[PDB]
Every structure is written in C-alpha cells, then in structure tokens.
Write an enzyme that holds these catalytic residues in place. Structure first.
Site, PDB file in Angstrom:
ATOM      1  N   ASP A 178     -15.134  -4.956   9.308  1.00  8.20           N
ATOM      2  CA  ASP A 178     -16.321  -4.449   8.628  1.00  8.20           C
ATOM      3  C   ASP A 178     -17.072  -5.517   7.830  1.00  8.20           C
ATOM      4  O   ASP A 178     -18.183  -5.264   7.375  1.00  8.20           O
ATOM      5  CB  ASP A 178     -15.945  -3.286   7.698  1.00  8.20           C
ATOM      6  N   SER A 200     -11.986  10.695  -3.924  1.00 13.65           N
ATOM      7  CA  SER A 200     -11.458  10.382  -2.607  1.00 13.65           C
ATOM      8  C   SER A 200      -9.945  10.256  -2.650  1.00 13.65           C
ATOM      9  O   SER A 200      -9.341  10.223  -3.721  1.00 13.65           O
ATOM     10  CB  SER A 200     -12.081   9.098  -2.075  1.00 13.65           C
ATOM     11  N   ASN A 218      -9.026   5.146   3.042  1.00 13.63           N
ATOM     12  CA  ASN A 218      -9.734   5.942   2.031  1.00 13.63           C
ATOM     13  C   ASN A 218     -10.698   6.928   2.669  1.00 13.63           C
ATOM     14  O   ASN A 218     -11.565   6.509   3.438  1.00 13.63           O
ATOM     15  CB  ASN A 218     -10.485   4.969   1.092  1.00 13.63           C
ATOM     16  N   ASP A 274      -6.485   8.185  -0.559  1.00 10.12           N
ATOM     17  CA  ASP A 274      -5.997   7.186   0.388  1.00 10.12           C
ATOM     18  C   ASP A 274      -4.811   7.733   1.158  1.00 10.12           C
ATOM     19  O   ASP A 274      -3.930   8.374   0.557  1.00 10.12           O
ATOM     20  CB  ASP A 274      -5.560   5.920  -0.346  1.00 10.12           C
ATOM     21  N   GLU A 309       0.802  -1.214   0.000  1.00  7.47           N
ATOM     22  CA  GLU A 309       0.000   0.000   0.000  1.00  7.47           C
ATOM     23  C   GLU A 309       0.836   1.266   0.000  1.00  7.47           C
ATOM     24  O   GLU A 309       0.509   2.245  -0.707  1.00  7.47           O
ATOM     25  CB  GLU A 309      -0.928   0.009   1.198  1.00  7.47           C
TER      26      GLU A 309
END
Ligand SMILES: [Cl-]
Ligand SMILES: [Cl-]
Ligand SMILES: [Cl-]
Ligand code: NA
Length: 129
Positions: free
Chosen positions: A101, A50, A59, A52, A35
């Site tokens: 989540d 958006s 995000n 990150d 990442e």
C-alpha cells in the site's frame, strides 16, 4: 490456533510471504509474534472503534468488514472473522495488499517498533524450511 515459530514460518512460506515485497520471512514471523503471539484468534479493540483481527492484527478501519466500524472500508473484501481462521490464507492475502500500500511493513506499528532493524533472521533460526 496458536502456531509454533517454525510452524508459522513454514505456513507463511507455503503461502508466498517469504520475501514478499522484499520482506524476509523473519520479518513476517517477528511481526506475527508481537502482533498476536502467533494466535490466529487474537482480537483487539482500538480506541477509535475499529478492531484488529488475527495473527497480523489487521484493522477493520480499512481492510475487513466487521459491521461495527462506521465509515470504514473493506479493501481486502473479506469479513474480519475470516482473519481468525486456523488456515492463514486470508490473513496472508490481505497482508500482501497491506504491505503493498506504500509504507511497506510500517503499516504494522509493532513491526516498526519491535522488529524493524533487528536481527529478524533469529525468528527462523533452526527451522526446516
Ligand atoms: Cl462497519
Ligand atoms: Cl495455514
Ligand atoms: Cl518497503
Ligand atoms: Na471496515
């Protein structure tokens, strides 16, 4: 801050990420590698507007507020800039919410594409943990 591999592993363990939601420490280090290349200051714009943020590229569409992502939420209740700090606490706390989540670490597309199923223990090889 650009972490070393074992340095980040140790910091993640220190903040309770090792085996969080059943994901071993190497999974988390691997995700951070792909990442952000372990750079806490990494930011990347998404085509939808958006952005990150941070070592785990969290995000602004859902998780943090940056003031410029219309219609977005802030489910970690933090400014996105907090996710860029040398201290990884805020990114870890938010990542714990993300991975809880429903879809586990598949929330990180780079983890799914580059870490999932691989020898992720290699990422903590040799580390004094
Ligand atoms: Cl916004
Ligand atoms: Cl830290
Ligand atoms: Cl899972
Ligand atoms: Na947001």
């Amino acid at each position: 801050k650009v972490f070393g591999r074992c340095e980040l592993a140790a910091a993640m363990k220190r903040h309770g990420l090792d085996n969080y939601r059943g994901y071993s420490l190497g999974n988390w280090v691997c995700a951070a590698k792909f990442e952000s290349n372990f750079n806490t200051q990494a930011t990347n714009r998404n085509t939808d507007g958006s952005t990150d943020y941070g070592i785990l590229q969290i995000n602004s569409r859902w998780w943090c507020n940056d003031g410029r992502t219309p219609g977005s939420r802030n489910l970690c209740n933090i400014p996105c800039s907090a996710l860029l700090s040398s201290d990884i606490t805020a990114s870890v706390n938010c990542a714990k919410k993300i991975v809880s989540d429903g879809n586990g670490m598949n929330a990180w597309v780079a983890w799914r594409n580059r870490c999932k199923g691989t020898d992720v223990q290699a990422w903590i090889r040799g580390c004094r943990l």
